[PDB]
Amino acid sequence: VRMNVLADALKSINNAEKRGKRQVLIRPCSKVIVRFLTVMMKHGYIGEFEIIDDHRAGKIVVNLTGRLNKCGVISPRFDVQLKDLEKWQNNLLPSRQFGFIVLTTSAGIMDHEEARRKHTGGKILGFFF
Amino acid sequence: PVARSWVCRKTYVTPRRPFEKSRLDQELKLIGEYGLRNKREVWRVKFTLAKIRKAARELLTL
Amino acid sequence: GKCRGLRTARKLRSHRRDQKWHDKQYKKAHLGTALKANPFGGASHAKGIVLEKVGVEAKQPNSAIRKCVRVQLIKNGKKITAFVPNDGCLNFIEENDEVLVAGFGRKGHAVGDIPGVRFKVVKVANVSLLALYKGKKERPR
Amino acid sequence: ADIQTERAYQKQPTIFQNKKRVLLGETGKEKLPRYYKNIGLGFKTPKEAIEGTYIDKKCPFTGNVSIRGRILSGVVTKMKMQRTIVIRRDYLHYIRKYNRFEKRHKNMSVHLSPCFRDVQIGDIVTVGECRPLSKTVRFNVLKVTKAAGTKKQ
Amino acid sequence: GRMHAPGKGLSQSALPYRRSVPTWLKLTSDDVKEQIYKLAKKGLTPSQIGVILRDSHGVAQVRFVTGNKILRILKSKGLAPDLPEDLYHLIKKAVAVRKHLERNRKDKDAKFRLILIESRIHRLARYYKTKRVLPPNWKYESSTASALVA
Amino acid sequence: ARGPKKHLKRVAAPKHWMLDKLTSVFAPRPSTGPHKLRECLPLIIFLRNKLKYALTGDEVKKICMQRFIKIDGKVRADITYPAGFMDVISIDKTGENFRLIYDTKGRFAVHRITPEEAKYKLCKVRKIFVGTKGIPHLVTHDARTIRYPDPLIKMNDTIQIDLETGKITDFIKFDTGNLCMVTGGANLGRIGVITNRERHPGSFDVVHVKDANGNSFATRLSNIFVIGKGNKPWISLPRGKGIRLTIAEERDKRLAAKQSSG
Amino acid sequence: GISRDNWHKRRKTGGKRKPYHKKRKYELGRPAANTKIGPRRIHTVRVRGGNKKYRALRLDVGNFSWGSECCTRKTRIIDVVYNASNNELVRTKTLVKNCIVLI
RNA sequence: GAACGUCUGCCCUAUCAACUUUCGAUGGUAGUCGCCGUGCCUACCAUGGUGACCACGGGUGACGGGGAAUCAGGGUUCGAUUCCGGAGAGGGAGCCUGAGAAACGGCUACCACAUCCAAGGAAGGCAGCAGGCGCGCAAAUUACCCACUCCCGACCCGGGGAGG
RNA sequence: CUCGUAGUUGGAUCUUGGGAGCGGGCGGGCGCGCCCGUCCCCGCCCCUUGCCUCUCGGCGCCCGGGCCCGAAGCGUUUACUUUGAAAAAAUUAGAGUGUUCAAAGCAGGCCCGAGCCGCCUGGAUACCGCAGCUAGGAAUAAUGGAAUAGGACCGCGGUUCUAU
Tell me the domains of chain E and their CATH numbers: 26-80 (no CATH), 81-150 (1.10.287.10)
Separation of CA B8 and C1' I99 in angstroms? 14
CATH number of A1-68: 3.30.1370.30
Nearest to F89 by CA among F74, F102, F77: F74
Residues 6 or more apart whose Cβ sits within 8 Å of residue A127:
A71, A72, A74, A88, A92, A93, A99, A100, A101, A102
Residues 6 or more apart whose Cβ sits within 8 Å of residue C91:
none
Q: Using CA atoms, how far apart are residues C132 and F135, in angstroms rounded to an integer?
A: 97
Let me know whether G69 and G91 are in one domain.
yes
Q: Which residue is nearest to nucleotide H1 (CA to C1')?
A: F4
Q: Using CA atoms, how far apart are residues C59 and F204, in angstroms rounded to an integer?
A: 83
Q: Are β-strands F74-75 and F192-198 bridged in parallel, bridged antiparallel, or unpaired?
A: unpaired
Strand partners, G37: G59
CATH topology of domain A69-129: Dna Ligase; domain 1 (3.30.1490)
Distances (CA, A) of D17 to D12, D26, D33, D49: 9, 5, 8, 18
Q: Using CA atoms, how far apart are residues G32 and G47, in angstroms rounded to an integer?
A: 14
Let me know whether G92 and G49 are in one domain.
yes
Let me know whether G71 and G51 are in one domain.
yes
What does R_g of chain E's alpha carbons equal in angstroms? Answer: 19
Let me know whether G21 and G64 are in one domain.
no
Our count of domains for chain G comes to 2
Which bases of chain I come closer than 7 Å to a protein CB? 2-5, 7-16, 38, 41-42, 71-73, 79-82, 84-86, 88-98, 102-110, 117-126, 129-140, 144-145, 147-150
Q: Using CA atoms, how far apart are residues E79 and A12, in angstroms rounded to an integer?
A: 49
Q: Using CA atoms, how far apart are residues F10 and F38, in angstroms rounded to an integer?
A: 14
Question: Is D21–G9 a contact, with Cβ atoms under 8 angstroms apart?
Answer: no
**Window 88-107 of chain A: CB closer than 7 A to strand I:** 104-107
The amino acid at A58: G
**Window 8-37 of chain B: CB closer than 7 A to strand H:** 10
Q: Using CA atoms, how far apart are residues D125 and D110, in angstroms rounded to an integer?
A: 10
Region class of B23: left (phi > 0), else alpha (psi between -120 and 50), else beta? alpha
A87-91, long-range: CB < 8 A, 24+ apart: A88/A112, A88/A124, A88/A127
Chain D CB contacts of G12 below 8 Å: 135-136
* Kind plus residue range of the DSSP H or E element containing E128: helix E111-131
Separation of CA D124 and C1' I112 in angstroms? 83
Let me know whether G68 and G41 are in one domain.
yes
Q: How was this structure obtained?
A: cryo-EM
Q: How far is CA F130 from the centre of its chain?
A: 27
Q: Using CA atoms, how far apart are residues B5 and F21, in angstroms rounded to an integer?
A: 7
Q: Using CA atoms, how far apart are residues D44 and C134, in angstroms rounded to an integer?
A: 95
Closest Cα in chain C to D101: C7
- Contact by Cβ (8 Å): F19, F13: yes
Q: What backbone phi and psi angles, to 5 degrees, belong to E127?
A: -80, -55
* Kind plus residue range of the DSSP H or E element containing B34: helix B22-34
Separation of CA D2 and C1' H50 in angstroms? 35
Q: How many helices (H) and strands (E) does chain B have?
A: 2, 0
Q: Using CA atoms, how far apart are residues F167 and F135, in angstroms rounded to an integer?
A: 13
Let me know whether G21 and G41 are in one domain.
no
CB contact C6 to A (< 8 Å) = yes
Nearest to F104 by CA among F227, F248, F243: F243
Residues 6 or more apart whose Cβ sits within 8 Å of residue A45:
A65, A67, A68, A128
Q: Using CA atoms, how far apart are residues D86 and A121, in angstroms rounded to an integer?
A: 39
Chain C CB contacts of D100 below 8 Å: 6-9, 12
Closest Cα in chain A to E18: A54
Q: Tell me the residue ranges of DSSP E strands in chain G.
A: 41-46, 52-58
Q: How many CB atoms are located within 10 Å of the residue F223 CB?
A: 18
C-alpha triplet B26, B29, B31: angle, nearest 5°: 120
Q: Using CA atoms, how far apart are residues D3 and F49, in angstroms rounded to an integer?
A: 73
Separation of CA G15 and C1' H157 in angstroms? 63
Chain B CB contacts of F24 below 8 Å: 3
First to last CA, chain G: 37
Q: Residue G23 is part of which domain span?
A: 1-30
- Contact by Cβ (8 Å): G85, G69: no
- Contact by Cβ (8 Å): A125, A102: yes
Q: Using CA atoms, how far apart are residues G27 and G48, in angstroms rounded to an integer?
A: 9
Q: Using CA atoms, how far apart are residues F197 and F191, in angstroms rounded to an integer?
A: 15
- Contact by Cβ (8 Å): F209, F219: yes
First to last CA, chain A: 30
Residues 6 or more apart whose Cβ sits within 8 Å of residue G86:
none
CB contact F202 to D (< 8 Å) = yes
How many inter-chain contacts (D to F, CB under 8 Å) are there? 4
CB contact D45 to G (< 8 Å) = no
- Contact by Cβ (8 Å): D51, D31: no
Let me know whether G59 and G102 are in one domain.
yes
Q: Using CA atoms, how far apart are residues F42 and F59, in angstroms rounded to an integer?
A: 15
Q: How many CB atoms are located within 10 Å of the residue F146 CB?
A: 19
Chain F CB contacts of D71 below 8 Å: 202
* Kind plus residue range of the DSSP H or E element containing A117: helix A112-118
Q: Using CA atoms, how far apart are residues D92 and F228, in angstroms rounded to an integer?
A: 49
How many inter-chain contacts (C to D, CB under 8 Å) are there? 22
| Start-end of H helices in chain F | 43-45, 57-60, 62-66, 115-119, 250-253
Our count of domains for chain D comes to 1
Q: How far is D139 from chain E (nearest CA, A)?
A: 31
Let me know whether G81 and G64 are in one domain.
yes
Q: Using CA atoms, how far apart are residues F98 and F90, in angstroms rounded to an integer?
A: 7
Separation of CA F11 and C1' H68 in angstroms? 20
Q: How far is CA D62 from the centre of its chain?
A: 9
Q: Using CA atoms, how far apart are residues F125 and F154, in angstroms rounded to an integer?
A: 8
- Contact by Cβ (8 Å): C96, C124: no
CB contact D10 to G (< 8 Å) = no
Q: Using CA atoms, how far apart are residues G21 and G27, in angstroms rounded to an integer?
A: 13
Q: Using CA atoms, how far apart are residues D75 and D146, in angstroms rounded to an integer?
A: 10
Question: Is F201–D71 a contact, with Cβ atoms under 8 angstroms apart?
Answer: no
CA-based torsion, D58, D60, D62, D66: positive or negative: positive
Strand partners, C57: C65
- Contact by Cβ (8 Å): G12, D135: yes
Burial class of C41 by CB neighbour count within 10 A (0 to 12, 13 to 18, 19+): exposed
